[PDB]
Amino acid sequence: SFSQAVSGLNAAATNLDVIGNNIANSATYGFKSGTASFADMFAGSKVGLGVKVAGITQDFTDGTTTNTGRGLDVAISQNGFFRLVDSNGSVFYSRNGQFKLDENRNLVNMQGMQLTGYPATGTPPTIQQGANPAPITIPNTLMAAKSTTTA
Amino acid sequence: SFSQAVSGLNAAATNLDVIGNNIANSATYGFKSGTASFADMFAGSKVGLGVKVAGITQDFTDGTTTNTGRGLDVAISQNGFFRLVDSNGSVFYSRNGQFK
Amino acid sequence: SFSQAVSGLNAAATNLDVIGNNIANSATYGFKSGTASFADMFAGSKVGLGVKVAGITQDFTDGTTTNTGRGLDVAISQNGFFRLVDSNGSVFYSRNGQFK
Amino acid sequence: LDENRNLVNMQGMQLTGYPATGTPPTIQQGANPAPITIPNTLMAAKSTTTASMQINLNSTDPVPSKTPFSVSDADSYNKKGTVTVYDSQGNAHDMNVYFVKTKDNEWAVYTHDSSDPAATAPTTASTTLKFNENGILESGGTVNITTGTINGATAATFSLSFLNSMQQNTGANNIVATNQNGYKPGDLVSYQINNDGTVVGN
Amino acid sequence: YSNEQEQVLGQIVLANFANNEGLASQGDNVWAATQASGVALLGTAGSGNFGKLTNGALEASNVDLSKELVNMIVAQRNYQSNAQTIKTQDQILNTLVNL
Amino acid sequence: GKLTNGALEASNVDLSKELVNMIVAQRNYQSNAQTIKTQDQILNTLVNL
Amino acid sequence: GKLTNGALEASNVDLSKELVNMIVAQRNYQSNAQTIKTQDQILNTLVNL
Numbered sequence: 001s002f003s004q005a006v007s008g009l010n011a012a013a014t015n016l017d018v019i020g021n022n023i024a025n026s027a028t029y030g031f032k033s034g035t036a037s038f039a040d041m042f043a044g045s046k047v048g049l050g051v052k053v054a055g056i057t058q059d060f061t062d063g064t065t066t067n068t069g070r071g072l073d074v075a076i077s078q079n080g081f082f083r084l085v086d087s088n089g090s091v092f093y094s095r096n097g098q099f100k101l102d103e104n105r106n107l108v109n110m111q112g113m114q115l116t117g118y119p120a121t122g123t124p125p126t127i128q129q130g131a132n133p134a135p136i137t138i139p140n141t142l143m144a145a146k147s148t149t150t151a
Numbered sequence: 152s153f154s155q156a157v158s159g160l161n162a163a164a165t166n167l168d169v170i171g172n173n174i175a176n177s178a179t180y181g182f183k184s185g186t187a188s189f190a191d192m193f194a195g196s197k198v199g200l201g202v203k204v205a206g207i208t209q210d211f212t213d214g215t216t217t218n219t220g221r222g223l224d225v226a227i228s229q230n231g232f233f234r235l236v237d238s239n240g241s242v243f244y245s246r247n248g249q250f251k
Numbered sequence: 252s253f254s255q256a257v258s259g260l261n262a263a264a265t266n267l268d269v270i271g272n273n274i275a276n277s278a279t280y281g282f283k284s285g286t287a288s289f290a291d292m293f294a295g296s297k298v299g300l301g302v303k304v305a306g307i308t309q310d311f312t313d314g315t316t317t318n319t320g321r322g323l324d325v326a327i328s329q330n331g332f333f334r335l336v337d338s339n340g341s342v343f344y345s346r347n348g349q350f351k
Numbered sequence: 352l353d354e355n356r357n358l359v360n361m362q363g364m365q366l367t368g369y370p371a372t373g374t375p376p377t378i379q380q381g382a383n384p385a386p387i388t389i390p391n392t393l394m395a396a397k398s399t400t401t402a403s404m405q406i407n408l409n410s411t412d413p414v415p416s417k418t419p420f421s422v423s424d425a426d427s428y429n430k431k432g433t434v435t436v437y438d439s440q441g442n443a444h445d446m447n448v449y450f451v452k453t454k455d456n457e458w459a460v461y462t463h464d465s466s467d468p469a470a471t472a473p474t475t476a477s478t479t480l481k482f483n484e485n486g487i488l489e490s491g492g493t494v495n496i497t498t499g500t501i502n503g504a505t506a507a508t509f510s511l512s513f514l515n516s517m518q519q520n521t522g523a524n525n526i527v528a529t530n531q532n533g534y535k536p537g538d539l540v541s542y543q544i545n546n547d548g549t550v551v552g553n
Numbered sequence: 554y555s556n557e558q559e560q561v562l563g564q565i566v567l568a569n570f571a572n573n574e575g576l577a578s579q580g581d582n583v584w585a586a587t588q589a590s591g592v593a594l595l596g597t598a599g600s601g602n603f604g605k606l607t608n609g610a611l612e613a614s615n616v617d618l619s620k621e622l623v624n625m626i627v628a629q630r631n632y633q634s635n636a637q638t639i640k641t642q643d644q645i646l647n648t649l650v651n652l
Numbered sequence: 653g654k655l656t657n658g659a660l661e662a663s664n665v666d667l668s669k670e671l672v673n674m675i676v677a678q679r680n681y682q683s684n685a686q687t688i689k690t691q692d693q694i695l696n697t698l699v700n701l
Numbered sequence: 702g703k704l705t706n707g708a709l710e711a712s713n714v715d716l717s718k719e720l721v722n723m724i725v726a727q728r729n730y731q732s733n734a735q736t737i738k739t740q741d742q743i744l745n746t747l748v749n750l
Binding site: 061062063064065067 | 254258294295301303304
Binding site for chain 2: 656662680684685
């Protein structure tokens with residue numbers, strides 16, 4: 001007859017776990033605190049059989065912007081995320097602004113994700129919004145000389 | 152269990168330690184301030200696992216060029232590093248402009 | 252939490268820094284007075300979040316015109332800037348007239 | 352929200368509510384309740400049909416010296432304004448309405464199309480407004496004004512109302528009330544629920 | 554460059570989903586799309602429902618220490634409160650088995 | 653960059669900035685400890701029970 | 702590697718990491734004590750019939 005009683009402990013532990021997770025990840029810039037969501041159960045006849053967990057919901061509301069300087073860091077103030085790719089080619093989403101250039105000269109975060117964007121093609125170079133996203137790189141090569149045509 | 156908390160506790164200590172060093176390193180000539188960056192974890196379930204330090208990051212802005220008046224003293228102005236080698240022969244790069 | 256208070260702390264420290272820099276630069280021959288400008292934050296809620304630094308604004312009033320007697324030196328009377336190019340490239344703009 | 356933009360609780364149980372129908376959609380109190388959805392489809396252009404504008408007039412304004420009506424002459428008329436109206440394709444048509452005084456307490460109104468230079472500048476008076484002794488208008492406020500056709504877009508016809516007009520000396524002419532019932536096509540931005548229970552989307 | 558010329562190498566693409574709360578965090582502070590979340594719905598940071606960015610700025614952790622500390626005390630008491638039910642169920646069954 | 657002669661780099665740290673980060677990190681530390689206090693407390697009640 | 706005169710190497714122990722590990726170890730030690738008590742009572746009933 002412990003089924004309803006023990007179910008509360010698991011929910012209480014899970015609720016305590018989420019609270020611990022939120023405070024453990026303090027000061028993390030790309031962090032989004034979650035929240036517990038419970039649900040009762042009734043399978044018999046007018047006797048509560050315990051509790052359930054419906055999943056943790058994060059708080060998507062934006063935080064406070066901070067001025068850290070640099071140039072490889074951007075912030076988002078409302079709806080909109082970033083799109084990132086890995087070595088295999090999977091698509092990941094995050095709101096971390098921390099970026100760096102590796103020896104391959106790619107826009108990469110601290111973990112190894114390649115920032116993606118619309119490639120700039122054409123002469124003169126321009127950004128087309130109808131192209132498939134491509135990793136954004138900064139080559140060391142110099143641009144070729146331009147023949148004057150319009151003055 | 153402790154996993155949701157103790158790791159963060161450790162993280163907290165690191166967040167303090169990186170500050171203390173900066174407090175101690177407030178008199179060195181070639182120092183660069185450092186902070187920490189963290190990241191959460193997720194198991195198969197949708198419950199967090201804690202937090203681990205993603206890594207120590209360092210700032211690379213330029214400090215004030217204090218004038219001392221010694222002949223063999225030089226200070227960089229933008230992106231750049233002096234290059235040094237040891238007795239063994241390893242390569243190192245720095246910005247401390249103290250020479251003898 | 253601390254966000255509002257620490258943001259105000261940082262803004263006040265920045266303004267004090269600007270004032271100190273203005274005091275220090277009271278002798279350079281091409282300086283322009285700098286001032287700070289701030290703004291507050293407001294998220295989806297109704298309570299305030301703190302203050303940023305909207306930016307640093309330079310003053311572009313023309314100062315006095317000292318007469319030193321040298322020949323290789325000039326001073327601009329109104330809008331206009333000397334255009335200079337160092338070493339590799341880049342086009343910098345200045346107003347100081349001390350010419351080597 | 353669900354995968355297909357449906358309001359739903361945490362357990363996958365679809366929410367219910369009042370179905371919304373009409374142009375513009377409204378709430379039917381007697382209609383059969385149906386699941387509430389928030390589609391992201393964009394609304395098309397809405398044609399301009401009803402417009403209103405109230406203008407305050409001055410009783411000590413002298414008659415213009417240059418009697419013939421001119422569009423590029425300042426004193427040829429008294430008041431000029433920009434009336435923003437939209438066609439069936441959402442294009443912005445700004446109408447230049449000109450006020451000119453011919454005799455005591457009588458005004459002649461002109462209509463001009465600014466977004467379409469191909470239109471002819473107005474020279475003859477469109478309609479006449481006659482204010483009574485006390486300055487309260489009695490009739491003649493409904494005038495039909497048509498837009499110009501550009502880039503294969505059908506002309507827009509709307510009825511302009513000069514209702515609730517006064518003539519007492521207010522010093523100088525000023526604009527306080529201007530509105531149109533036609534708006535350009537737009538896209539969904541954000542949605543919220545009011546305390547009355549309806550769902551309103553920006 | 555040194556030739557007084559401006560060039561573009563790309564733009565930052567933004568993806569807003571038709572349904573939030575469907576992004577399962579994986580590994581580091583990143584989120585992976587799946588069903589019950591919609592398509593990526595790429596776009597630019599200028600127009601659409603995608604907001605403006607700000608270079609040289611970073612978002613905070615959007616957490617409140619005061620809210621978590623007080624919820625910590627409430628969570629502990631609830632966790633101890635259920636333990637009383639187990640203890641009561643233990644004693645109530647011990648008397649029956651031993652008659 | 654240019655190499656100024658007779659000059660040395662600064663410490664690149666401004667004490668006013670870390671003197672408050674230290675305080676907020678501390679308060680975070682006792683918050684954690686209260687968690688871990690609660691974790692010890694919780695486990696304590698269950699084990700003695 | 703290189704050496705350095707007039708200096709010594711520390712003990713490379715952090716009390717921050719040990720204290721939290723000591724708490725965890727104690728509970729683990731407390732916990733297993735329950736199993737002995739549980740196994741003791743579960744056998745006491747059987748012998749007493």
